[PDB]
Amino acid sequence: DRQKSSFQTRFNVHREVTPVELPNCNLVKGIDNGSEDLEILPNGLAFISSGLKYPGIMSFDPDKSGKILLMDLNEKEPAVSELEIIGNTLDISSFNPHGISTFIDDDNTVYLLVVNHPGSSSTVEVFKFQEEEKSLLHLKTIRHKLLPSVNDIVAVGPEHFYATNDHYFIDPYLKSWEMHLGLAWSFVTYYSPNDVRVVAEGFDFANGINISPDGKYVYIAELLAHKIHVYEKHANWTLTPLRVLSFDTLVDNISVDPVTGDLWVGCHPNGMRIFFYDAENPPGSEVLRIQDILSEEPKVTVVYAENGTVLQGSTVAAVYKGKLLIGTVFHKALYCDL
Ligand SMILES: O=c1ccc2ccccc2[nH]1
Ligand SMILES: O=c1ccc2ccccc2[nH]1
Ligand SMILES: [Br-]
Ligand SMILES: [Br-]
Ligand SMILES: [Tb+3]
Ligand SMILES: [Tb+3]
Numbered sequence: 001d002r003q004k005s006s007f008q009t010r011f012n013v014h015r016e017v018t019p020v021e022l023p024n025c026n027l028v029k030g031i032d033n034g035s036e037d038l039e040i041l042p043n044g045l046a047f048i049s050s051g052l053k054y055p056g057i058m059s060f061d062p063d064k065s066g067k068i069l070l071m072d073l074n075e076k077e078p079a080v081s082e083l084e085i086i087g088n089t090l091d092i093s094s095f096n097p098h099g100i101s102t103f104i105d106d107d108n109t110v111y112l113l114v115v116n117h118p119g120s121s122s123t124v125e126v127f128k129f130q131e132e133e134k135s136l137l138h139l140k141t142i143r144h145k146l147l148p149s150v151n152d153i154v155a156v157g158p159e160h161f162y163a164t165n166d167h168y169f170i171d172p173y174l175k176s177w178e179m180h181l182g183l184a185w186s187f188v189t190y191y192s193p194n195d196v197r198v199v200a201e202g203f204d205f206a207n208g209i210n211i212s213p214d215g216k217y218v219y220i221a222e223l224l225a226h227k228i229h230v231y232e233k234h235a236n237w238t239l240t241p242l243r244v245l246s247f248d249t250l251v252d253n254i255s256v257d258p259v260t261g262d263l264w265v266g267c268h269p270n271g272m273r274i275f276f277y278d279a280e281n282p283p284g285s286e287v288l289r290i291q292d293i294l295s296e297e298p299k300v301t302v303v304y305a306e307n308g309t310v311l312q313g314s315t316v317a318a319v320y321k322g323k324l325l326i327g328t329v330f331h332k333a334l335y336c337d338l
Contacts, residue, residue: 006182010204010224011271012250017284020305022324025336027310030080031069033061035327037099037152037253040318044074045131047083047112048327049097055120055172058277058330066097068114068127068136073320078335087138090125094118099152099208099253101161102129111158112136115150120172122150124191126159144196146189149175152253153191154211154218156237160192162199162218164206179205179224188220190237199239200231208254208316212261217242219263219293221251224271228254228263230293245298249286250274255318263290266316266326269305274313274329285314285334287326304336 007013028035031050038048051066053059069080085092098115105111110129115122123143127136140159149167156162167175168185178185187201188209200220208221211233218239220229226247231239250268257264265288268274273283284307291299304317304326312331317324319338326334 003182007180010182011275012226012248012269013272015248015270017269017286017305017307018302019307020302022304022336022338025310025334028071028078028080028325028333028335031327031333032331033059033064034330035069035333036315036329038316038318038325038327039100039102039255040073040320040325041102041104041110042258044072044320046071046073046318046320046325047100047102048080048333049100049114051096052098052329053096053117054098054329056176057275060330065093066095068097068100068112070134071325073323073325081134084133084135085127085138086135090138090141091118097125098150099164101153101155103155103158103160105158109158111139111155113153113155113161115153115163120170122147122165124150124153124161124163142191144189144191146196146198147191149186151207152209154209156211156215157192161190162209162211163189163191164203164209164220165189166205166207166223182224184225188239192237199237200229200241207252208265210254210256210263213256213258214261217294219254219256221254221265223250223252223268226250228265228290243294245290245293245300247288247300249288251288252314253316255316257319260291261293263293264288264303264317264319265290266314268313268315273308282308282312282331284308285311285326285328287314287317287324303338310334
């Protein structure tokens with residue numbers, strides 16, 4: 001009976017959101033089947049993954065494929081366009097994109113890394129962004145025993161990244177049990193061409209992951225524990241615990257403002273509404289800002305929140321020059337003035 005009290009805190013079973021309004025929010029035209037992750041380059045180009053199919057999660061078009069979208073946030077009325085995937089090393093028909101990350105090389109080549117779930121497996125797909133042609137050149141499919149159930153990655157090189165696994169098991173049945181039981185066996189993996197190893201473990205659904213603009217610190221979101229973990233990142237790529245922030249919302253993906261180092265976090269206020277869909281009780285949205293995360297008292301602000309009648313199931317938010325872009329597991333996306 002301790003397993004029913006725990007399941008109910010973990011999943012925030014009776015929480016309701018306190019709305020926090022922003023002026024001039026607009027749904028992004030063309031985004032109606034998810035925008036689980038996104039990343040804004042310094043130049044204001046934004047990549048969005050959409051169409052995620054996740055075992056046991058709502059989907060309005062179970063049979064249409066995922067895609068990567070592009071938005072130019074320097075435009076005042078930004079429109080989304082579908083990036084074309086070129087290459088013969090990847091089967092696009094099964095494409096099911098999840099978390100993403102980018103890395104800009106010394107030569108200014110932009111690499112896009114994309115978590116992909118063809119079937120119940122996980123890969124990380126490496127693309128080279130071709131800006132002029134609005135297209136993604138496929139370079140490499142990455143798979144490993146230590147990338148069983150990848151949720152997000154943060155790129156530290158063109159085929160180098162830290163990855164969260166949100167489950168230990170691959171079989172959808174077992175990981176459903178693993179989640180309900182609260183085993184907390186999910187873990188974080190460092191991947192490079194030369195070395196692949198676990199760098200942190202024992203997580204209740206590890207989810208978002210990102211890095212400070214100076215590379216010194218790594219941030220890991222633990223969804224069902226409502227925690228964000230901070231780590232010291234050494235030059236040999238090991239991680240050592242430093243802090244743990246707690247929240248009373250389910251934290252999903254982390255974005256990092258390059259100018260300040262602030263974390264911007266997409267959150268699920270109520271775990272039941274996001275995990276067990278019900279078109280009559282849709283899940284809401286919530287966006288946190290965390291400032292001076294190393295200080296003794298970090299500043300945590302709710303910047304946007306709503307019960308779901310506009311935007312359902314916020315997973316990610318990032319800011320660009322006064323605007324805020326918010327994405328969701330399977331619903332729409334919102335572009336707001338701050
Ligand atoms: O922290 C732990 C503890 C036990 C255990 C058993 C099987 C697999 C992973 C495990 N992790
Ligand atoms: O990144 C993710 C992916 C799927 C998902 C499903 C339910 C709740 C949160 C989730 N987060
Ligand atoms: Br398995
Ligand atoms: Br909610
Ligand atoms: Tb990401
Ligand atoms: Tb996520």
